[PDB]
Amino acid sequence: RIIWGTNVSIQECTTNFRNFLMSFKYKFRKILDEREENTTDEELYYIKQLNEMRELGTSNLNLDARNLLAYKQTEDLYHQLLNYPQEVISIMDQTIKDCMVSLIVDNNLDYDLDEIETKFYKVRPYNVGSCKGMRELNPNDIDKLINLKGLVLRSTPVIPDMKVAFFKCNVCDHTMAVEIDRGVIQEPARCERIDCNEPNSMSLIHNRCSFADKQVIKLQETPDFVPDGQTPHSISLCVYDELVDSCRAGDRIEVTGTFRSIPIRANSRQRVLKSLYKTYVDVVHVKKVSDKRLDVDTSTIEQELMQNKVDHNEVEEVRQITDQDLAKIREVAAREDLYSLLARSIAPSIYELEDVKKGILLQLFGGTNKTFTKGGRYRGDINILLCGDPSTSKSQILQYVHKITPRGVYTSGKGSSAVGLTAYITRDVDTKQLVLESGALVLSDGGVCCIDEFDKMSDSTRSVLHEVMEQQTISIAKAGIITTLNARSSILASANPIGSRYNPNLPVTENIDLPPPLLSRFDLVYLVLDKVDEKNDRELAKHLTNLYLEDKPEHISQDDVLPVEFLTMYISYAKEHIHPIITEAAKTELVRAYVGMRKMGDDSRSDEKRITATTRQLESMIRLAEAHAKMKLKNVVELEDVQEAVRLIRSAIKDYATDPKTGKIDKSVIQRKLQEDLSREIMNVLKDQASDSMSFNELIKQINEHSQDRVESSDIQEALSRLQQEDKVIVLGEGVRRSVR
Amino acid sequence: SDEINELKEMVKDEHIYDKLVRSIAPAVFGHEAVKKGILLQMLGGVHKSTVEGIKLRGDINICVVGDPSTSKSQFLKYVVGFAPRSVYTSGKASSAAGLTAAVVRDEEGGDYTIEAGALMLADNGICCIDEFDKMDISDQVAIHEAMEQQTISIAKAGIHATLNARTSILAAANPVGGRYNRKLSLRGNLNMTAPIMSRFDLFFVILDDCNEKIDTELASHIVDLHMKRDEAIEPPFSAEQLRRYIKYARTFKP
Amino acid sequence: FDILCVVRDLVDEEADERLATFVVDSHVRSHQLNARQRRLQRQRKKEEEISPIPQELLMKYIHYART
Amino acid sequence: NSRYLANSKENFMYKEKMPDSQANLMDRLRERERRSAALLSQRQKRYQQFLAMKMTQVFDILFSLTRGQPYTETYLSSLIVDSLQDSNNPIGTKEASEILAGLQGILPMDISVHQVDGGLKVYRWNSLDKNRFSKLL
Ligand SMILES: Nc1ncnc2c1ncn2[C@@H]1O[C@H](COP(=O)(O)OP(=O)(O)OP(O)(O)=S)[C@@H](O)[C@H]1O
Numbered sequence A: 001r002i003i004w005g006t007n008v009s010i011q012e013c014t015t016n017f018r019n020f021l022m023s024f025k026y027k028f029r030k031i032l033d034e035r036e037e038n039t040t041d042e043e044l045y046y047i048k049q050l051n052e053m054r055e056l057g058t059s060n061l062n063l064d065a066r067n068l069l070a071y072k073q074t075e076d077l078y079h080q081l082l083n084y085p086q087e088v089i090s091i092m093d094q095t096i097k098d099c100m101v102s103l104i105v106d107n108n109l110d111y112d113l114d115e116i117e118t119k120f121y122k123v124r125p126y127n128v129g130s131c132k133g134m135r136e137l138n139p140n141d142i143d144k145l146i147n148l149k150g151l152v153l154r155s156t157p158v159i160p161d162m163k164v165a166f167f168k169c170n171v172c173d174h175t176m177a178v179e180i181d182r183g184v185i186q187e188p189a190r191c192e193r194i195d196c197n198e199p200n201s202m203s204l205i206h207n208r209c210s211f212a213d214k215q216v217i218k219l220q221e222t223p224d225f226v227p228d229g230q231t232p233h234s235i236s237l238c239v240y241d242e243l244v245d246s247c248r249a250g251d252r253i254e255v256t257g258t259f260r261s262i263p264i265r266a267n268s269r270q271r272v273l274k275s276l277y278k279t280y281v282d283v284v285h286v287k288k289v290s291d292k293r294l295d296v297d298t299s300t301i302e303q304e305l306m307q308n309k310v311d312h313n314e315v316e317e318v319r320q321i322t323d324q325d326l327a328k329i330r331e332v333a334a335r336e337d338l339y340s341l342l343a344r345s346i347a348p349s350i351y352e353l354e355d356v357k358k359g360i361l362l363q364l365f366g367g368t369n370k371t372f373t374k375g376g377r378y379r380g381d382i383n384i385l386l387c388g389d390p391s392t393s394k395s396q397i398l399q400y401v402h403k404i405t406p407r408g409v410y411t412s413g414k415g416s417s418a419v420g421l422t423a424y425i426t427r428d429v430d431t432k433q434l435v436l437e438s439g440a441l442v443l444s445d446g447g448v449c450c451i452d453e454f455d456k457m458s459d460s461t462r463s464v465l466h467e468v469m470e471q472q473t474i475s476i477a478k479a480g481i482i483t484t485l486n487a488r489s490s491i492l493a494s495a496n497p498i499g500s501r502y503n504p505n506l507p508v509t510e511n512i513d514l515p516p517p518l519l520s521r522f523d524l525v526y527l528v529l530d531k532v533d534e535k536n537d538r539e540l541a542k543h544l545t546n547l548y549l550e551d552k553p554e555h556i557s558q559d560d561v562l563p564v565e566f567l568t569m570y571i572s573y574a575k576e577h578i579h580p581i582i583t584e585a586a587k588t589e590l591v592r593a594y595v596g597m598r599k600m601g602d603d604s605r606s607d608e609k610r611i612t613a614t615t616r617q618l619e620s621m622i623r624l625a626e627a628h629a630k631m632k633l634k635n636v637v638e639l640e641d642v643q644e645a646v647r648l649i650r651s652a653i654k655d656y657a658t659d660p661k662t663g664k665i666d667k668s669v670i671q672r673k674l675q676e677d678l679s680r681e682i683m684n685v686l687k688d689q690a691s692d693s694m695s696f697n698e699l700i701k702q703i704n705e706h707s708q709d710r711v712e713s714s715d716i717q718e719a720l721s722r723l724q725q726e727d728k729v730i731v732l733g734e735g736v737r738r739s740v741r
Numbered sequence B: 001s002d003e004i005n006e007l008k009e010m011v012k013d014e015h016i017y018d019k020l021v022r023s024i025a026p027a028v029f030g031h032e033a034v035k036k037g038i039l040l041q042m043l044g045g046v047h048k049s050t051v052e053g054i055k056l057r058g059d060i061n062i063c064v065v066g067d068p069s070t071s072k073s074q075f076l077k078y079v080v081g082f083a084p085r086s087v088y089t090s091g092k093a094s095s096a097a098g099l100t101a102a103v104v105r106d107e108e109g110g111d112y113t114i115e116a117g118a119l120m121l122a123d124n125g126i127c128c129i130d131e132f133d134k135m136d137i138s139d140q141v142a143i144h145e146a147m148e149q150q151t152i153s154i155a156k157a158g159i160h161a162t163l164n165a166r167t168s169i170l171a172a173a174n175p176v177g178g179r180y181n182r183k184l185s186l187r188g189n190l191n192m193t194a195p196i197m198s199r200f201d202l203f204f205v206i207l208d209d210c211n212e213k214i215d216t217e218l219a220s221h222i223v224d225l226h227m228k229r230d231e232a233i234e235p236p237f238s239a240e241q242l243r244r245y246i247k248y249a250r251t252f253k254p
Numbered sequence C: 001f002d003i004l005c006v007v008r009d010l011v012d013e014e015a016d017e018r019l020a021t022f023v024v025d026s027h028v029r030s031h032q033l034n035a036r037q038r039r040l041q042r043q044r045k046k047e048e049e050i051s052p053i054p055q056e057l058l059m060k061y062i063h064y065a066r067t
Numbered sequence D: 001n002s003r004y005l006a007n008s009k010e011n012f013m014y015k016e017k018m019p020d021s022q023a024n025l026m027d028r029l030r031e032r033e034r035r036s037a038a039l040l041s042q043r044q045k046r047y048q049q050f051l052a053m054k055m056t057q058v059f060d061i062l063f064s065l066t067r068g069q070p071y072t073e074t075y076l077s078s079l080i081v082d083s084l085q086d087s088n089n090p091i092g093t094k095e096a097s098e099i100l101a102g103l104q105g106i107l108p109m110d111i112s113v114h115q116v117d118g119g120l121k122v123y124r125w126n127s128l129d130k131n132r133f134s135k136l137l
């Protein structure tokens, strides 16, 4: 039968769809995906889900449209879905109930064949192809299946909706109940079964009448593409009876639903309407939070859909994976200069100041969510201030990162207030509820933020940080409402030392202005100091003039290939397929590293001027080393992977013991003595080692490992080079090292 | 009669008072001073009125003040999740009016009425707070009556009323200079007036200093925490049976 | 104003001891038809531990006076 | 006296000074570990006791109000806690999970619980009589 309004005939669709629901297997999906193969040898996926639901009575069947797509002879339906949801959904539910019936007439007992057939069945097709957010939504697709992302602002309280009337038992004494099946409600003039009152005033008992949940959910899409000038848009939503309350305020949900368009009234007295319809989205399915908190539930059966959703994590969350892409990934991971390479691969236009890039990269992979049943909220990510002499790429690095990440929210300082930093709540008097608004920090829930002129920020502001940075929550308490909105977000602030540059006659923690609490709050502080080198200076000048040479300049730095686009998907794979477990050996070297950090910081006059190593130093070391191990796709933290973490934390501090003001205008006498004693000992060994030849490595294990920590061993290279000039020994091939006759 | 056996156990044991105090902060490391201060908080006094003359307070207000990284916010964001009917407010974000009571208009009768606020909806429970120092005096003031007189009194927009707020309070403000000079004294070091310094019937200026036989233990502890697998953190008494044991002990009025 | 009650807290080795005894005894005394008799009269015995006039007398007194 | 669980004497002082025994205390301690086996297990049975009494009401907690058939585990638990268990006699979440497991086990006739991916969904209520099996403490 052809449809007068869609010309999409039913019989063929239902017929193909039936054996579609019986021919379905995991493999179709795998072939399109191209991922490595079993799924218990590809059992029938749909009968799996169908049996499970029949036994659980969910009557809701989640479905990824790409699955139905990846099967032969169904793409017709796969597109008609995107084009005729209003009826393909109907025929889908019909087929669902009918295959339930065939299954139960094959499967002896379930619902006695009737309780099943009585209750309806709804389908939940999600992930039909992510549309291009709001500003793309065309009035040409008024009735199509859109996918939208973005957090929700406000949820109207549960609103009932008439479904079946229950009309007043008249003096005739036989109440009558009737549904509506449209926006119309008909009350029969005559009274009840007997026409005791043919003329009658039938009334309605609006308490026993059934109802249906209709929740209106405003939505503010993610600022993935919002160019400038306009605040990210908003698309009101409606939800019908099963996904209701699956989305509280503040959540970061994703939705797949049909677009709609309805006129409005102006006077509301006369029946005349207005052109320029208003629009919303009748949702169909809601990807729950796109998060992994899993503290407690929110709603009814819907959580069963959430459990059916979370298990397929790999392809659905990567949104793209191929072992040619994954092979490229593992290959890159194999490359040795990785930590260097990817560093520059973040901001290729940025010059030699690599350690900044390193810290930034480590921020991108930030930490792992260790969720405790007791305690909890251990700020899974990190936070990086950076400061230094004006005009030193800081602000541009921030721009660069904010562009890199898929969730960044740029923001300035001193042009912003505490409300801007942490959403502000409003008791809406319309429905007397809690709405949240414009959290700059909340927009960045997940993924980094950026903040400039951090010093120039007001003291009235720069106080919400004192909370959000260490608990990732904001506890607002004003006249109407008290609440705590959690905003997990890795801040990344620029700065400017007081005045307009250093004063290497001034203490460092005074040269930075911020108070020590908020300062130690920052996981990692950089001091990008400007030098008068004249050795890098001309290199930098060339590094600018070259980009000015071309018209459309690319790869401003050395011409080494680096994957400007690949690295983003690389990151969004790493942060989600690997969770570093801190092995035992790491624990030791981490503890000793902390102890050494703190004992060094010890002093009597370190109290007022220095930055003291405190427990957050250990938090930094651990949350940062596990991020390093997440990089390189390492599944478990090694021991030689916290060492560079220590190095990075020491980027700021290396050069002062009792008083700050590093100074350190970079061959020392104590270095002379070091080389000299090493020469003594190594000559004594090689003259005691009668087999006069041994490798540099063997010699190192002979001496440099007998006791406490190994030495550079390139200072050993200079030692043996001296012993070549002096000719006390002879390398005699790289494999060994002999002495002189 | 069954649960009587469970209490009977958890109360007839000899060292409960110790078994309890080292089992209030399973994650936190040590601080056997403060943990005691909290365990006593959830167990109020008697608040029994005097001769018909007057009524006196029967509640305790511990007020930690500590150097950086002393795990002082952990105690709060724990208590407020374990003490019944409690509330956590950052303070500086909030305002004094919000903290005690709000006056607001309603369209039902076109009249002014009361908003409970943190203090009134925190009745008979701990109402923890953060960063007093950051809370400008404009809001520090609005608490005093919920400290000693135990009740708030408000005369605004025509409505005069008085609501009793039997609420334990807390605090976690940081010293003036973030960290406080061991050099300087304590007088010109806390930056808070005399009264609100007195009304706190505890005081814990927590320090933070260097050591080896301490910092090693602390680091091992934090690591074991971040090593989920090594959640050997199980204290004697769970964070649940402690609740029922309290809900019993709340009734003795010795 | 006319009267200015100037109060002051001063450390004393002894006066505070007596005051303390007083306050402790205060927190000590704080905490059918014949039970109600035995209760009212015991409350009045506590009203007499502070030996001068009982309260209800004094509030009726102030009412009488100001009238 | 009536089980007013006070201890006004045990806190008197270090009265425990009369017994001036020899190393005989090791003797006592030699048996201590023995009872440690029973004591522990005894405490264990206490929950086999304690949880018991709790479930005596639970088959009238979910029953008498909740006739939604597909109920899961997390939702039902978070209902049990914060139910009347916010009164004099509180309880913990995972303890509620234990209560559910025990109810199912002591009545597998109706209560059928089978887990899918996370959280054990629970059966479709059919309202038996219970204490007849509650006597099986
Ligand atoms: N090493 C460098 N690599 C790349 N660009 C550089 C470098 N040094 C300076 N620049 C350029 O010099 C300018 C400095 O910009 P920024 O340093 O980001 O601004 P800014 O440093 O934040 O200014 P202030 O005073 O610190 S707020 C930009 O045009 C940079 O591209």
Ligand SMILES: Nc1ncnc2c1ncn2[C@@H]1O[C@H](COP(=O)(O)OP(=O)(O)OP(O)(O)=S)[C@@H](O)[C@H]1O
Residues within 6 Å of the ligand: A378, A466, A470, A517, A518, A521, A615, A616, A619, B027, B028, B029, B066, B067, B068, B069, B070, B071, B072, B073, B074, B173, B174, B218, B221, B222
């Ligand atoms: N004694 C401790 N044992 C274990 N971990 C600790 C300890 N002290 C602090 N930490 C950890 O270090 C972090 C900082 O703790 P706090 O200093 O309490 O933070 P805070 O409460 O924001 O302090 P302020 O004064 O408000 S900046 C916490 O997330 C703890 O996990």
